[PDB]
Design an enzyme around this catalytic site. Structure first.
Site, PDB file in Angstrom:
ATOM      1  N   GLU A 158     -34.931   2.582  11.318  1.00 63.41           N
ATOM      2  CA  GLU A 158     -34.780   2.872   9.898  1.00 63.41           C
ATOM      3  C   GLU A 158     -33.704   2.006   9.270  1.00 63.41           C
ATOM      4  O   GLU A 158     -33.906   1.468   8.171  1.00 63.41           O
ATOM      5  CB  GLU A 158     -34.474   4.371   9.717  1.00 63.41           C
ATOM      6  CG  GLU A 158     -35.695   5.240   9.994  1.00 63.41           C
ATOM      7  CD  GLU A 158     -35.415   6.696  10.241  1.00 63.41           C
ATOM      8  OE1 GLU A 158     -34.257   7.149  10.084  1.00 63.41           O
ATOM      9  OE2 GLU A 158     -36.403   7.415  10.569  1.00 63.41           O
ATOM     10  N   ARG A 205     -29.250  11.611  12.436  1.00 62.78           N
ATOM     11  CA  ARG A 205     -29.436  11.891  13.857  1.00 62.78           C
ATOM     12  C   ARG A 205     -29.706  13.384  14.031  1.00 62.78           C
ATOM     13  O   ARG A 205     -28.864  14.223  13.704  1.00 62.78           O
ATOM     14  CB  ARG A 205     -28.205  11.406  14.622  1.00 62.78           C
ATOM     15  CG  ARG A 205     -28.284  11.455  16.120  1.00 62.78           C
ATOM     16  CD  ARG A 205     -29.304  10.487  16.630  1.00 62.78           C
ATOM     17  NE  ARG A 205     -28.905   9.089  16.489  1.00 62.78           N
ATOM     18  CZ  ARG A 205     -29.693   8.081  16.826  1.00 62.78           C
ATOM     19  NH1 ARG A 205     -30.931   8.295  17.242  1.00 62.78           N
ATOM     20  NH2 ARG A 205     -29.225   6.835  16.763  1.00 62.78           N
ATOM     21  N   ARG A 206     -30.903  13.710  14.531  1.00 60.58           N
ATOM     22  CA  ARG A 206     -31.347  15.104  14.563  1.00 60.58           C
ATOM     23  C   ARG A 206     -30.363  15.987  15.307  1.00 60.58           C
ATOM     24  O   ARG A 206     -30.098  17.125  14.886  1.00 60.58           O
ATOM     25  CB  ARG A 206     -32.733  15.200  15.208  1.00 60.58           C
ATOM     26  CG  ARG A 206     -33.317  16.616  15.288  1.00 60.58           C
ATOM     27  CD  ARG A 206     -33.751  17.182  13.931  1.00 60.58           C
ATOM     28  NE  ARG A 206     -34.854  16.446  13.313  1.00 60.58           N
ATOM     29  CZ  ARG A 206     -36.129  16.826  13.320  1.00 60.58           C
ATOM     30  NH1 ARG A 206     -36.533  17.903  13.978  1.00 60.58           N
ATOM     31  NH2 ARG A 206     -37.019  16.116  12.636  1.00 60.58           N
ATOM     32  N   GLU A 226     -45.617  13.688   6.808  1.00 60.03           N
ATOM     33  CA  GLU A 226     -46.823  14.483   6.962  1.00 60.03           C
ATOM     34  C   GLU A 226     -47.730  13.846   8.018  1.00 60.03           C
ATOM     35  O   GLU A 226     -47.233  13.279   9.011  1.00 60.03           O
ATOM     36  CB  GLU A 226     -47.457  14.657   5.587  1.00 60.03           C
ATOM     37  CG  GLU A 226     -46.535  15.432   4.658  1.00 60.03           C
ATOM     38  CD  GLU A 226     -47.204  15.879   3.383  1.00 60.03           C
ATOM     39  OE1 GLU A 226     -48.128  15.195   2.911  1.00 60.03           O
ATOM     40  OE2 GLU A 226     -46.799  16.930   2.852  1.00 60.03           O
TER      41      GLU A 226
HETATM   42  O1  LIG Z   1     -37.297  10.795  16.573  1.00 62.04           O
HETATM   43  P1  LIG Z   1     -36.088  11.494  17.208  1.00 62.04           P
HETATM   44  O2  LIG Z   1     -35.589  10.798  18.431  1.00 62.04           O
HETATM   45  O3  LIG Z   1     -36.419  12.973  17.433  1.00 62.04           O
HETATM   46  O4  LIG Z   1     -34.990  11.511  16.051  1.00 62.04           O
HETATM   47  P2  LIG Z   1     -33.527  10.922  15.861  1.00 62.04           P
HETATM   48  O5  LIG Z   1     -32.544  11.981  15.614  1.00 62.04           O
HETATM   49  O6  LIG Z   1     -33.223  10.048  17.075  1.00 62.04           O
HETATM   50  O7  LIG Z   1     -33.672  10.028  14.526  1.00 62.04           O
HETATM   51  C1  LIG Z   1     -34.462  10.561  13.450  1.00 62.04           C
HETATM   52  C2  LIG Z   1     -34.421   9.721  12.194  1.00 62.04           C
HETATM   53  O8  LIG Z   1     -35.404   8.700  12.436  1.00 62.04           O
HETATM   54  C3  LIG Z   1     -36.243   8.580  11.290  1.00 62.04           C
HETATM   55  C4  LIG Z   1     -35.748   9.525  10.198  1.00 62.04           C
HETATM   56  F1  LIG Z   1     -36.797  10.206   9.547  1.00 62.04           F
HETATM   57  C5  LIG Z   1     -34.948  10.523  11.009  1.00 62.04           C
HETATM   58  O9  LIG Z   1     -33.889  10.921  10.151  1.00 62.04           O
END
Ligand SMILES: O=P(O)(O)OP(=O)(O)OC[C@H]1OC[C@@H](F)[C@@H]1O
EC number: 3.2.2.6
Length: 140
Positions: free
Chosen positions: A82, A9-10, A39
């Site tokens: 995911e 979760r970013r 990419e």
């Molecule tokens: O796309 P958002 O909402 O900015 O990102 P989230 O934090 O909600 O989730 C990001 C995760 O999804 C795919 C994977 F690569 C990444 O670790």
């Protein structure tokens, strides 16, 4: 392609996800994290491809990390997406718990409730080397 996909979760797990990436790469694993390996192109197709390509699915469970999955039955949330892919594909799922409270299964959409059945690893700030060693034992 990468042997390990890191899902995080970013807004709460970005630092631990990056720390896991560095350690796993130092121990010889090819790792996918979005900020390094996502990419050009339509990210929906690229992300699902990268999950499918990796034997191991490392799920960073920071505090509240599954909250946006709740009531996401249209599967618009990207961690939800995911996780469903990893479950569907029968990946080696390795949850990493960092202050995460386990929810009741019924608060999550049915297509991801099985994620709670995988043995998780508790992230220890005091014993990080030991934590990483255990993660590596869980990887395939
Ligand atoms: O796309 P958002 O909402 O900015 O990102 P989230 O934090 O909600 O989730 C990001 C995760 O999804 C795919 C994977 F690569 C990444 O670790």
């Amino acid at each position: 392609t990468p042997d390990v996909f890191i899902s995080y979760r970013r807004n709460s797990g970005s630092q631990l996800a990056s720390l896991l990436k560095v350690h796993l790469q130092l121990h010889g694993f090819s790792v996918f994290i979005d900020v390094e390996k996502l990419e050009a192109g339509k990210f929906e197709d690229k992300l699902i491809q990268s999950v499918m390509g990796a034997r191991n699915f490392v799920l960073v469970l920071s505090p509240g990390a599954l909250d946006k999955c709740m009531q996401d039955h249209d599967c618009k949330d990207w961690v939800h997406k995911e996780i469903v892919t990893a479950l569907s594909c029968g990946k080696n799922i390795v949850p990493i718990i960092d202050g995460f409270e386990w929810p009741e299964p019924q608060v999550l959409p049915e297509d991801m409730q099985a994620v709670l059945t995988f043995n998780g690893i508790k992230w220890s700030h005091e014993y990080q080397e030991a934590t990483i060693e255990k993660i590596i034992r869980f990887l395939q």
